Amino acid sequence: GLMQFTLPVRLCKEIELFHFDIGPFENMWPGIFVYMVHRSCGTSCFELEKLCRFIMSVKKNYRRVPYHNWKHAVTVAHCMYAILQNNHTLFTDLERKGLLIACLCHDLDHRGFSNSYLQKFDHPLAALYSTSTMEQHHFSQTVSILQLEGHNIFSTLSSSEYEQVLEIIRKAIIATDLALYFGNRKQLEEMYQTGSLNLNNQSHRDRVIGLMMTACDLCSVTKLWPVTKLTANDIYAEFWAEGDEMKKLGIQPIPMMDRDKKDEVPQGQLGFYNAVAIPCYTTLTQILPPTEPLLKACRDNLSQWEKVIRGEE
Numbered sequence: 106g107l108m109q110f111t112l113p114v115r116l117c118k119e120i121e122l123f124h125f126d127i128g129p130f131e132n133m134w135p136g137i138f139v140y141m142v143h144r145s146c147g148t149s150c151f152e153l154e155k156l157c158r159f160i161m162s163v164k165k166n167y168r169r170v171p172y173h174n175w176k177h178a179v180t181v182a183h184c185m186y187a188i189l190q191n192n193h194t195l196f197t198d199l200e201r202k203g204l205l206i207a208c209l210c211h212d213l214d215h216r217g218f219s220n221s222y223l224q225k226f227d228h229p230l231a232a233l234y235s236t237s238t239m240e241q242h243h244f245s246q247t248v249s250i251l252q253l254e255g256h257n258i259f260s261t262l263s264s265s266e267y268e269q270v271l272e273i274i275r276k277a278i279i280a281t282d283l284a285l286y287f288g289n290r291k292q293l294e295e296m297y298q299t300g301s302l303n304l305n306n307q308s309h310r311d312r313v314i315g316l317m318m319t320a321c322d323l324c325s326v327t328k329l330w331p332v333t334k335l336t337a338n339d340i341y342a343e344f345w346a347e348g349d350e351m352k353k354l355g356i357q358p359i360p361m362m363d364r365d366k367k368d369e370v371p372q373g374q375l376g377f378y379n380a381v382a383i384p385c386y387t388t389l390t391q392i393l394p395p396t397e398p399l400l401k402a403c404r405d406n407l408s409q410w411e412k413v414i415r416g417e418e
């Protein structure tokens with residue numbers, strides 16, 4: 106009850122910042138997450154015995170893939186913590202609980218392959234879930250872990266609060282499907298500009314939480330350049346492996362996934378920042394002004410990719 110997690114001074118201070126990197130010490134990541142739950146939600150939100158057992162089972166069900174791994178889970182949860190802490194009064198007790206767990210669980214059992222590769226392979230998960238294939242799997246895996254004996258961190262919620270929190274987590278995890286992001290942001294753009302955006306409208310909150318999830322999910326483009334640049338290697342190691350596996354099905358992959366076309370990556374990163382990342386953090390900044398540091402860091406990293414192309418690095 107009276108047992109806080111306390112981080113070393115440099116982490117205690119930097120963890121409050123959007124651009125915080127959780128570091129290379131894996132054994133510190135569970136404590137970093139509990140710390141964030143305690144400050145974001147409260148020390149009463151979860152039974153520490155159950156939370157700790159939930160965290161370690163979530164960890165175990167992330168695979169040793171280059172990018173979509175346990176470190177990504179905790180990184181995405183930290184970005185959400187930073188958004189919730191800079192927007193104190195906009196989010197309910199249930200939403201603060203649901204969203205940190207949602208981010209931690211959002212890529213459970215990822216194999217490092219896209220929804221497209223599952224469909225072209227004809228993977229069983231592509232027959233069980235026709236759209237947002239991996240994301241429905243990620244939510245499925247979250248529910249499984251919640252139902253392990255001693256793992257139900259939500260046991261103290263009423264029946265109706267329990268249903269609301271699982272519904273928040275489900276929508277949050279589905280929203281991490283980048284194919285759904287484009288239409289969600291376009292709708293949020295219209296609503297903000299015509300002035301119809303209303304945070305008491307549940308369908309509107311849903312969309313705003315969706316954008317937050319995309320923002321947290323892409324947060325590696327909002328770090329200091331060296332973090333962003335070295336994380337890019339990890340994401341491309343998965344892309345190129347998927348490209349290799351496309352060639353083994355006798356399908357030439359898109360150039361982004363073809364390790365024979367590494368030269369095209371700087372230009373492909375520009376397209377990604379311009380088409381996806383910058384618009385995402387722009388709309389998020391309009392809806393939640395205190396999240397402007399994410400947009401600023403993202404523009405700084407666009408400029409750094411522009412310098413790569415111009416041969417300045």
Ligand SMILES: OCc1ccn2nc(-c3ccccc3)nc2c1
Nearest residue numbers: 323325326333334336337340377
């Ligand atoms: O630097 C870290 C980083 C983080 C996330 N993503 N996601 C992409 C991406 C996703 C789809 C298409 C193209 C690029 N690139 C990056 C780079």
Ligand SMILES: [Mg+2]
Nearest residue numbers: 211212239281
């Ligand atoms: Mg995902």
Ligand SMILES: [Zn+2]
Nearest residue numbers: 177211212322
């Ligand atoms: Zn993710």
